[PDB]
């Protein structure tokens, strides 16, 4: 249904702020570590510009027509107003973003399946209070550096398939077992995953670089659920733990 080669109606556009660590430009399709800014009244994305550089010399035969070239670009000034919910995360995190000069990353997700991720710092936080109208919070973010348009991530293989094969063997205290995940639907993929223990007590799990290590902290039958990327697919694995 989402066709990036046909015009879209705009409704359904979403705003997120990168609350994790690492490279936000790498895999922006996944929603992991992206806190959502809900209840957006209106949005005005930044306009990439370019300064004009004068490229005229004295020797240049004839000067009837001006000659110029491109200069510095300076993507900047993405603004948006949302509803005022002072006691909800994403909005408190927004005020925290304002209170230091942090240059954080933020992404805009469009209904046609494409993403536009920028990186900037908050330069304005306002508020409009009138009767018979919901109080709105207005934000403005000055963008720094080169952004990441949706015209760069034009590959998208869409995945649509994965499997999780665990060891499913008893693990003794202090020893780490390795779990396997196949995320190769014809090889090319553009998604990640995260696995989190369903009890957090009988075992400790760690997922890093396609390496899933599970340690049998306490005896029993631990269940490790894994969810891929934003959460299109998921799986459940079991690992026994023996007291001996």
How far does Cα 140 stand from its chain's mean position? 19
| Nearer Cβ to a copy of itself (52/157) | 52
Question: Is residue 58 involved in binding a copy of itself (CB under 8 A)?
Answer: yes
When the beta carbons of 1 and 58 are compared against a copy of itself, the nearer one is: 58
The window from 19-27, 94-102, 106-114, 129-137 that contacts a copy of itself (CB under 8 A) reads 129-137
Choices 18-26, 72-80, 89-97, 130-138; region in contact with a copy of itself by CB under 8 A = 130-138
In whole angstroms, the minimum distance from the beta carbon of 32 to a copy of itself comes to: 43
Q: Which is nearer to a copy of itself, 60 or 186 (CB)?
A: 60
Query: C-beta of 50: minimal distance to a copy of itself in Å?
Result: 25
Q: Is 56 in the site for a copy of itself (CB under 8 A)?
A: yes
User: Quick count: other Cβ atoms within 10 Å of Cβ 227?
Assistant: 15
Contact residue for a copy of itself among 1, 6, 11, 129 (CB under 8 A): 129
- Give Cα separations from 184 to 60, 161, 178, 181, 239 (angstroms): 59, 8, 19, 9, 24
1 lies in the binding site for a copy of itself (CB under 8 A): no
Q: CB under 8 Å to 100, separation ≥6 — which residues?
A: none
Residue 143: both structure tokens together: 């963008």
Residues 6+ apart with CB under 8 A from 190: 27, 29, 155, 156, 157, 158, 159
The single-letter DSSP state of residue 26 is T
Q: Binding segment for a copy of itself among 54-62, 137-145, 158-166, 228-236 (CB under 8 A)? A: 54-62
Would you count residue 131 as binding a copy of itself (CB under 8 A)? yes
By the rule CB under 8 A, 72 interacts with a copy of itself: no
Q: Which residues contact 99 (CB under 8 A, 6 or more apart)?
A: none
Residue 139's CB is within 10 A of a number of other CB atoms, namely 22
Q: With binding defined as CB under 8 A, does residue 130 bind a copy of itself?
A: yes
- 3 touching a copy of itself, by CB under 8 A: no
132 lies in the site for a copy of itself, by CB under 8 A:
yes
With beta carbons less than 8 A apart as the criterion, state whether 45 and 116 touch.
Answer: yes
Instruction: Name which of 96 and 128 has its Cβ closer to a copy of itself.
Output: 128
CA-CA-CA-CA dihedral for 23, 28, 33, 37, to nearest 10: 130
Q: Which residues bind a copy of itself (CB under 8 A)?
A: 56, 58, 60, 63, 129-132
């Amino acid at each position: 249904v989402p066709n990036p080669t046909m015009p879209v109606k705009g409704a359904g556009t979403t705003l997120w702020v990168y609350k994790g660590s690492g490279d936000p430009y790498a895999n922006p399709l996944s929603d992991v570590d992206w806190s959502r800014l809900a209840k957006v009244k209106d949005l005005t994305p930044g306009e990439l510009t370019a300064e004009s550089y004068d490229d005229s010399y004295l020797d240049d035969e004839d000067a009837d027509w001006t000659a110029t070239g491109q200069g510095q670009k300076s993507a900047g000034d993405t603004s948006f107003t949302l509803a005022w919910m002072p006691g909800e995360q994403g909005q408190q995190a927004l005020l925290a973003w304002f209170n230091e000069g942090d240059t954080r990353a933020y992404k805009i997700r469009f209904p046609n399946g494409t993403v536009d991720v920028f990186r900037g710092w908050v330069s304005s936080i306002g508020k409009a209070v009138t009767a018979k109208e919901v109080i709105t919070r207005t934000v403005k973010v000055t963008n720094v550096g080169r952004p990441s348009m949706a015209e760069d991530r034009s590959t998208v293989t869409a995945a649509t398939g994965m499997t999780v094969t665990p060891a499913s063997t008893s693990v003794v205290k202090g020893q780490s077992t390795t779990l396997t995940v196949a995320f190769q639907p014809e090889g090319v993929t553009d998604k990640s995953f995260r696995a989190v223990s369903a009890d957090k007590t009988k075992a400790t799990v760690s997922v890093s670089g396609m390496t899933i290590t599970v340690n049998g902290v306490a005896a029993g039958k631990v269940n490790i659920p894994v969810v891929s990327g934003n959460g299109e697919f998921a799986a459940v694995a079991e690992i026994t733990v023996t007291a001996s």
